Every structure is written in structure tokens, then in C-alpha cells.
Paper text:
To gain understanding into the function of the cytadherence machinery of mycoplasmas, in this study we have determined the crystal structure of P110, a major adhesin of M. genitalium and an immunodominant protein of this emergent sexually transmitted pathogen. P140 and P110, which have been shown to be reciprocally stabilized, interact to form a transmembrane complex, called “Nap”, that accumulates at a polar structure known as the terminal organelle. The structure of the extracellular region of P110 is composed by two domains, the N- and C-domains, very different in size, with an overall shape and domain organization that can be sketched as the body and the stalk of capital letter P. Within the N-domain of P110, long connections between some blades and also between some β-strands create a structure, referred as “the crown”, containing a binding site for sialic acid oligosaccharides, as conclusively shown by the structures of the complexes of P110 with both 3′- and 6′-sialyllactose oligosaccharides.
Co-crystallization of erP110 with either 3′-sialyllactose (3SL: where the neuraminic acid forms an α2–3 linkage to a lactose monosaccharide) or 6′-sialyllactose (6SL: with an α2–6 linkage) resulted in complexes of both oligosaccharides with erP110, as determined at 2.2 and 2.5 Å resolution, respectively (Experimental procedures section). The oligosaccharides binding site, the same for both complexes, is located in an indent of erP110 in the upper part of the crown. In both complexes only the neuraminic acid moiety presents direct interactions with two short stretches of the protein: Pro197–Ser198–Pro199–Asn200 and Ser456–Phe457–Ser458. The carboxylate group from the neuraminic acid forms two hydrogen bonds with Ser458, one with the backbone amino group and the second with the side chain oxygen. Finally, the methyl group of the neuraminic acid is placed into a hydrophobic pocket close to the Phe457 side chain. In the refined structures, oligosaccharides present different occupancies (∼100% for 6SL and ∼60–70% for 3SL), which suggest different binding affinities in spite of the fact that neuraminic acid is making about the same interactions in both complexes. The lactose moiety of 6SL is also well defined in the 6SL complex, while density is progressively weaker for 3SL suggesting that, beyond the neuraminic acid, the conformation of this oligosaccharide can fluctuate. The third monosaccharide approaches the protein in 6SL, while it is projected towards the solvent in 3SL. Affinity between erP110 and the sialic acid compounds was experimentally characterized by Surface Plasmon Resonance using biotinylated 3SL and 6SL immobilized on a streptavidin chip.
Author numbering: 25 to 256, 261 to 412, 417 to 470, 478 to 591, 603 to 936
The structure:
């Protein structure tokens, strides 16, 4: 397709030429054409093999979770909420213009619930979602019991050394290590059948009700409402933010002022992104809410099937080592043959149940994904003298200082594997949050349930709204979240978490997508998928997005000062958006296959994912000292960091340039603040351009293997505005972009020109391109250097003067270099090219008409079409006469 598809609104897609003009009648209500009702909106769209695949979801959708029976998750079929999300394949049925017709329609059904799964879902609890306005202090949660309070009691670290052997804690130096955080204050935690509030606590260390749902609605909700009342009032906001409009902006659904139940929000968020292969449609969730499931649709699915989603809790990833998997699985909750009705994901042999998915794409017949591990830990829901009551069980898993430095060794270090170990330690006359070693034998970690309460205790599963496991308001949590934990060695290597701020990526083969479909369709007990072409990576938020961190008074989440420039009030929770794959246009040594990669934005930088196209694997190298070479992180400068990542609108890739274009649109900002103040900086847009860097695979015998990861560079391109409403950005070429925007209520075309890496508006080219006189393409004027340069034809007297009269028309016509001498071209931009096309008119004469490059690098002439429609640009023709018939 010689066209650009532009989503004009939530229902309509219009086809645009490279001249930034709409193809007449191309505008299509794809919702109406999918035979869906007006409550449906376009979530995402992609081209595969010339057909258009669109993901729809409905603002009317209602889902319920019933703890008993066994079709536990269903749509609310009463009223009008039986509104599943749909993928639709459209094909263009005309050779002239655009007429979308529906080919195939696929319903995304609610997930199956096994007996085993439903025992976990029963007491599953989920944090209220993170917004734009969530503060470091909002996330902060009350520090839980120490490891020795849980095990021994109110009863002294004098008896810590005598006793740690009777509680499986041999040689453990960390009696004062935290066992997690309290669920009586903080961000609201709610079951699948409950609703999140519109209120966020300013200090979650004091003002939340956490999971104390019943406390919230009888006591604290009234307080929050009087403090933080929705705009018509104006309130004090001493204690609570009100983020209703910010919740709406991230796809939270509402019955008036009340958010719909969690299961509804999960389903609605879960149908956000699609990708398409020869055999499959894959649907995944957005970067804003955790998702617990994803669809694998078989494109052959009969004309009307219910395509079942696969649980992530049934989807085993390779985390890079078996050990990196154990760290995640051990902190999911208490496993035990001995305990009763104590059901969590770990105890029921499930794996990591939730991700904050960056996006999904396809290259060749492979699916590529990335996301953040959503924090998931056990909590103690006991009712009576249980010490950890109403407490989440979570702990830093950050590698000790003594660890073998060399990635393999850093990430497989035993520190905090089975339970708590870090807090604070003064070695010599200096200090560390990290345990200084990994004596009388090997150091032991144990799960913070004391031996006696082993058979009585109720440890259930929760899911956090961010990539942090541990919200506890201690020093280590800040250092875990911000990447500040360093060894004291030679080359001073950074010590990673493997539970907090963990990024996940992979490539998924068609067989691997087939097992997921088989897991989703499992009768009875849960079937499992293994995805083996996957990795994880400790990816903290840049420490320089915070201020005033003490060391040389220890700062925790409740006092940590955000200066985060990227649209988030918080400086501790990482975020990712716009994963996108592309084939490298740069040739490879022959007998090897084309290179491909993907990129994704995270807070403070771009990540490059590197694949080996030989066998559609993660790129790797033989040495385990150097870090999985499938991942590279390049930090942003100030200009990239100033971009509000919550305004991400779309990402395209151009195979000719080998460049990614990330579009940001400020109209996506919410109407109002957490203080209910109208947001006024919602005008404008921004483009970030991503390019590959480093030595790429298979250039020459030398680079058949690599021991340095290819990476990417994100550059705020110069294409931005604080004044215009965006309609679209057309990346015509590496040298040019067209922006369609409105100042008033009509669409204006701006041409941005790339000057040595920086895009600048070119007002003369803009005026040339915009002067199309209501046609599809820029006008042509003889006397003007316009979008088409300027052509001056030689006079007819050049034939006689050059003794070309002694040549025939047929000779001249088969000598392109003679007929390049019948004009002088002035280019409008450097290296714009032009040739003359010749036509015999008689035995003695011919005409010539120019063929001229536009900004896209394509040649146009009298016969040019877009979508089969003649452009009728207005190129001249010139007769030359007096040639011989020899
Ligand atoms: O158990 C920890 C203790 O080890 C002993 O050898 C020292 O007396 C203390 O300085 C230290 O706090
Ligand atoms: K011209």
C-alpha cells in the first residue's frame, strides 16, 4: 500500500497519500462495518499481508467473578454488558480507492477457571492502579514485622543466635530484615468482585485503608470525599488525591462516579494490543493495568467460536536461569503439604500470574513481547494471635556485596532466595542496605511463617499495580527501585533485585502459541505452556529522576522527592510502552537471513531487543560473565525525558529508513489533576525517533558471533508542538515528515525537514505541499520552484545547434542522456531528482514530460496513482520537432 492509515477518532480510519491528503471516500466507521454497536471503540490495528486487523472493545462491558460454582468469570448478561472484545480482519475490495469489507470476526471470550485457579482467585486481591498523579508517598506502605518478631516474637535479638537453627535460619545475620508491609493503610487492595476507589492516599503510610475494604466504606471513604471532592466545590486535598478523570484516561470504566469491579477493569485492559502471524492473532493488555491472561486465536477458528485466553499463571517463562524463576515463585506465597485452605499461586504450583505488558508485535511468523513483572506476593488473611496479620510477605532479593561479579553469578546469587536477608548493616565505620556476604557454614533463608502457625495460617496471593514486590517504607526499597545498590569492589558493579523492577521479553514461535491455545482450551485441571525464547532483566527507574537521597535521616518512599520529568508524579515505579519490531534494511552476508530487532520505551531510556534470525532465538554469546546480549538499555537525554510517556499514542517502523517513530499526543492527558484542577497543557504532540547502534550480527565472518549487544538511540526528533491538535504524522522518508494538525478546526500540512539529525519546520515546502488546490497532490507551476522543483525546457533551436536533427525520434528516444539535455532542473531540496519520459508523436517529433521525486523518495509522473486513483498532478509536456526519418 502506497498509503498511510490514520485513526481520525475512536471509530473511523481514513487512508492518506504521501501528500498528506485523504483518499476520497476512504473514511470508514470500522465499528459500524464490524457490525458492533456504538459502545465499541478501536483499541489497536495492524496490517498483515495487505489486510487490516482491528481490535475492538466496548465501554458497556461488565464482567462478574462468583467465588462458588465453576464458571466463575462470566459477562453480566443482565441489562446490556454481554459485550466481548472482538478482532476483525478487513480486506480492501476495490482496485480504485479504499472500500473495507469484513472477512473474519473473532470473539475474545472470558478465561476458563479450574477448581485449583478459583481457590487462588477466591482471596486474590489487586492494588488500585498507578496514575499520572500517584506520589512516591502514595505507594509507600507501613513496614511489617521483622524476621525475628515473626519467628521468636516480642522476645529479643539476644536469643536470635540460640534459636535460628530451630526455625531453619542457620547463620542468618538479619534479625531486623523486613517480612514486608501492612495492608491496613495504603493504596486500596480489592478482590475481583469489588471496586477500586477514585481516591489515592497522599501518604499511604497513614491514609490508606489498604485491603480493609469494610473499614474504607464505613470510616475513611467519607473523610476522603470531604477532603478530595470531585469537581462540580473545591477542596483542601490535605490527605487524598482524587484521580477519577486520570482513571478514565487509562481505560477505567464507570457507572457514574463508581469504577466497575476489578474483573471488569482487568478484562477491558487485557484486550488492548494485537499482533498477527500467518496462523495466529495474539491479544494482550495495556501498560497501565496488570494483565493475567492473553488470547491466542487460530485464524482458522470457525465462523463463530469463543476464543479462550491463556493464564500467565499457566505460562512458564525462562527468566534466564532456573534460579531467577525460583526467586519470583518463592515470593508468590507459602507452599506446604501441611497447611489447610491456605491457597496462593505458589501453593497451587502456578507461576508469575501478572505482567504490565509493553506491547506485542510480529516479525516473520514470530510474536515478540516485553513487559514488567507485576509485583505478586503472599498476604496473611487470618482472623482471630497471628503476628503477620493483614501483612503482605515481601522482601528485597538484592544480591549481596561478596557475590562473584559477572552476570550469571550476580543473578544466581543465593541472597534472599527463600526469605528476608537485607535491611541495614554498618561494616567497619561505613554502611550498606545489602547483606555484605553470601562464619560456621552456609547462610540460610526461610519464608516468614513461624513453624507453629505452619498448619493454621492463611497465606493468599495479591497483585501490585507496579513492578515493585516490596512497598515497605525502608531505605533498601528506595535503593532497589532506583538501582542504587553497589558493591565496594574493583570495577564497582551494580547489585540487582530479581523480585523488584524486573523487565521480561521474548520471541514466541507458532508451536509455543499452539501450546498456549491448548492451555486455554484444557478441560478440567490446568494445562501448562513453556515459552523458552524469553529472558528477564533488573530494570530500575533512573536515580536522577529523584532529588536529595542521603548517605555520606535515611530516605524511604514516604520522603523520597520526585523531580521526574516524564509525566509521572512518582519516581519509583518503572513503566514501558510501544514495543515494536522491524527488519533491518542493511544487507547481511549472503546465505544468512535478514536481521530484525525490537525497541520499547521505559522510564529514562530505550531498550533494544536483539534476535538471531538463523533460528528465531534471543541473541546470546558463550560467556556467562557478560549479560544476556538479547538486551541493551540506552538512557535518554533531557529532551527525551521531558516527553510525557503517558501520552504515548502509536509507534510505526519504516523498513527503508530502519527507524522507529514514537508519536505522543497531549490530547490523551486527563481533563483534571488529582487536586481536581483543569489540565491546560493538553495541546500539542511530540515524536521520538529510534535508530539502531553498534556492530550488528552477520556483517562479515567476524560478526557471525558477537560478545557486545547491539543497542538503540532515542532522539526527540524536533517534530513537536504545544499549540496544535494532532491528526497524524507521516514519516515520508529519513529526510522528511508531514504533520497533519489543526490550529482552529481545519487540517493544516507542515513539512519537517531533517537537518543533520534535527527536524525543523520548512515553511516554504509546507506552503508548496499544502497548495494542492483541493486535489490529492501539490500543484505544479512552471515559473516556480515548488514541491516539484522547477523544470525549464530547452528551446526547439537546440536540435539544429547540436546537429541532433540528423538523429531519428527512435534514436533520441533510446538515449536517455540526450533527452536529459532537453531540460534544466532546479531541486526544491538537495538530491531531489527528475528525468524526462519521451513519447513519439510523429515521424519527426516527440514530447517529453518530467518524472520527479517527491519528499518520500518516490518518482511521480502523469500516470501516477495512489490506491489506484490517478493523481493528475499537472506535469507539463513539451514537443521537440525537426528530427529525421533517417
Ligand atoms: O552478632 C553481631 C555482633 O557480632 C559480635 O562479634 C560483635 O560483638 C558485635 O559488634 C556485632 O554486633
Ligand atoms: K515547478
Amino acid at each position: 500500500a502506497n498509503t498511510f492509515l490514520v485513526k481520525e477518532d475512536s471509530k473511523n480510519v481514513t487512508a492518506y497519500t504521501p501528500f498528506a491528503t485523504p483518499i476520497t471516500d476512504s473514511k470508514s466507521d470500522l465499528v459500524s462495518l464490524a457490525q458492533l454497536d456504538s459502545s465499541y471503540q478501536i483499541a489497536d490495528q495492524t496490517i498483515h499481508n495487505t489486510n487490516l486487523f482491528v481490535l475492538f472493545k466496548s465501554r458497556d462491558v461488565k464482567v462478574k467473578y462468583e467465588s462458588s460454582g465453576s464458571n466463575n468469570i462470566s459477562f453480566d448478561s443482565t441489562s446490556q454488558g454481554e459485550k466481548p472484545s472482538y478482532v476483525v480482519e478487513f480486506t480492501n475490495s476495490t482496485n480504485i480507492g479504499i472500500k473495507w469489507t469484513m472477512v473474519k470476526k473473532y470473539q475474545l471470550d472470558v478465561p476458563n477457571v479450574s477448581s485449583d485457579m478459583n481457590q487462588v482467585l477466591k482471596n486474590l486481591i489487586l492494588e488500585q492502579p498507578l496514575t499520572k498523579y500517584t506520589l512516591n508517598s502514595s505507594l509507600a506502605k507501613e513496614k511489617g514485622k521483622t524476621q525475628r518478631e515473626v519467628h521468636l516474637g516480642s522476645g529479643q535479638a539476644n536469643q536470635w543466635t540460640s534459636q535460628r537453627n530451630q526455625h531453619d535460619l542457620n547463620n542468618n545475620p538479619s534479625p531486623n530484615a523486613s517480612t514486608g508491609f501492612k495492608l491496613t493503610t495504603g493504596n486500596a487492595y480489592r478482590k475481583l468482585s469489588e471496586s477500586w476507589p477514585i481516591y489515592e492516599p497522599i501518604d499511604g503510610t497513614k491514609q490508606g485503608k489498604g485491603k480493609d475494604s469494610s473499614g474504607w466504606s464505613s470510616t475513611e471513604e467519607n473523610e476522603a470525599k470531604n477532603d478530595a471532592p470531585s469537581v462540580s466545590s473545591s477542596g483542601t486535598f490535605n490527605k487524598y488525591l482524587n484521580t477519577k478523570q486520570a482513571l478514565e484516561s487509562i481505560g477505567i470504566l464507570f457507572d457514574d462516579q463508581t469504577p466497575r469491579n476489578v474483573i471488569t477493569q482487568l478484562y477491558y485492559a487485557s484486550t488492548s494490543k494485537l499482533a498477527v502471524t500467518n496462523n495466529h492473532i495474539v491479544v494482550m493488555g495495556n501498560s497501565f493495568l496488570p494483565s493475567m491472561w492473553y488470547w491466542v486465536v487460530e485464524r482458522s477458528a470457525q465462523e463463530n467460536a469463543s476464543n479462550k485466553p491463556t493464564w500467565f499463571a499457566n505460562t512458564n517463562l525462562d527468566w534466564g536461569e532456573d534460579k531467577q524463576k525460583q526467586f519470583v515463585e518463592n515470593q508468590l506465597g507459602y507452599k506446604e503439604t501441611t497447611s489447610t485452605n491456605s491457597h496462593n499461586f505458589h501453593s497451587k504450583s502456578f507461576t508469575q500470574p501478572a505482567y504490565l505488558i509493553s506491547g506485542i508485535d510480529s516479525v516473520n511468523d514470530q510474536i515478540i513481547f516485553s513487559g514488567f513483572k507485576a509485583g505478586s506476593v503472599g498476604y496473611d488473611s487470618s482472623s482471630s494471635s497471628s503476628s503477620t496479620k493483614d501483612q503482605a510477605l515481601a522482601w528485597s532479593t538484592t544480591t549481596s556485596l561478596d557475590s562473584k561479579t559477572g552476570y550469571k553469578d550476580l543473578v544466581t546469587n543465593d541472597t534472599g532466595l527463600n526469605g528476608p536477608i537485607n535491611g541495614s548493616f554498618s561494616i567497619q565505620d561505613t554502611f550498606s542496605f545489602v547483606v555484605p556476604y553470601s562464619t560456621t557454614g552456609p547462610i540460610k533463608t526461610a519464608y516468614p511463617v513461624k513453624k507453629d502457625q505452619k498448619s493454621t495460617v492463611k497465606i493468599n496471593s495479591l497483585i501490585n499495580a507496579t513492578p515493585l514486590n516490596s512497598y515497605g517504607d525502608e531505605g533498601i526499597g528506595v535503593f532497589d527501585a532506583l538501582g542504587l545498590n553497589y558493591n565496594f569492589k574493583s570495577n564497582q558493579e551494580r547489585l540487582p533485585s530479581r523480585t523488584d523492577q524486573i523487565f521480561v521479553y521474548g520471541i514466541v514461535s507458532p508451536n509455543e502459541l499452539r501450546s498456549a491455545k491448548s492451555s486455554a482450551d484444557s478441560t478440567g485441571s490446568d494445562t501448562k505452556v513453556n515459552w523458552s525464547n524469553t529472558q528477564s532483566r533488573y530494570l530500575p527507574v533512573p536515580y536522577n529522576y529523584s532529588e536529595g537521597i542521603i548517605d555520606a535521616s535515611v530516605t524511604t518512599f514516604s520522603g523520597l522527592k520526585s523531580i521526574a520529568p516524564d509525566g509521572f508524579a512518582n519516581s519509583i515505579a518503572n513503566f514501558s510502552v510501544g514495543l515494536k519490531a522491524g527488519i533491518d534494511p542493511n544487507p547481511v552476508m549472503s546465505g544468512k537471513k535478514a536481521n530484525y530487532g525490537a525497541v520499547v520505551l521505559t522510564r529514562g531510556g530505550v531498550v533494544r531487543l536483539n534476535f538471531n534470525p538463523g533460528n528465531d532465538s534471543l541473541l546470546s554469546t558463550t560467556d556467562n560473565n557478560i549479560a544476556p546480549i538479547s538486551f541493551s538499555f540506552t538512557p535518554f537525554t533531557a529532551a527525551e525525558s521531558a516527553v510525557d510517556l503517558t501520552t504515548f499514542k502509536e509507534v510505526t517502523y519504516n523498513q527503508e529508513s530502519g527507524l522507529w517513530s514514537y508519536i505522543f499526543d497531549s490530547s490523551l492527558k486527563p481533563s483534571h489533576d488529582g487536586k481536581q484542577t483543569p489540565v491546560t497543557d493538553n495541546m500539542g504532540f511530540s515524536v521520538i525517533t529510534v535508530s539502531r547502534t553498534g556492530i550488528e550480527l552477520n556483517q562479515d565472518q567476524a560478526t557471525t558471533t558477537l560478545d557486545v549487544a547491539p543497542s538503540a538511540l532515542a532522539v526527540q526528533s524536533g517534530i513537536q508542538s504545544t499549540t496544535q491538535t494532532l491528526t497524524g504524522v507521516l514519516p515520508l522518508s529519513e529526510e522528511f515528515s508531514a504533520v497533519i494538525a489543526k490550529d482552529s478546526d481545519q487540517n493544516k500540512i507542515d513539512i519537517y525537514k531533517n537537518n543533520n539529525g534535527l527536524f525543523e519546520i520548512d515553511t516554504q515546502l509546507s506552503n508548496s505541499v499544502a497548495t494542492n488546490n483541493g486535489g490529492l497532490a501539490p500543484s505544479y507551476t512552471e515559473n516556480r520552484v515548488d514541491a516539484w522543483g522547477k523544470v525549464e525546457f530547452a528551446d526547439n533551436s537546440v536540435l539544429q545547434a547540436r546537429n541532433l536533427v540528423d538523429k531519428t525520434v527512435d534514436e533520441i528516444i533510446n538515449t536517455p542522456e540526450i533527452l536529459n539535455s532537453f531540460f534544466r532542473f532546479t531541486p526544491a531540496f538537495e538530491d531531489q531528482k527528475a528525468t524526462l519520459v519521451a513519447t513519439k508523436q510523429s515521424d519527426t517529433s516527440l514530447s517529453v514530460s518530467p518524472r520527479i521525486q517527491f519528499l518520500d523518495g518516490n518518482f511521480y509522473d502523469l500516470n501516477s496513482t495512489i490506491a489506484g486513483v490517478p493523481l493528475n498532478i499537472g506535469f507539463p509536456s513539451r514537443v521537440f520537432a525537426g528530427f529525421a526519418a533517417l
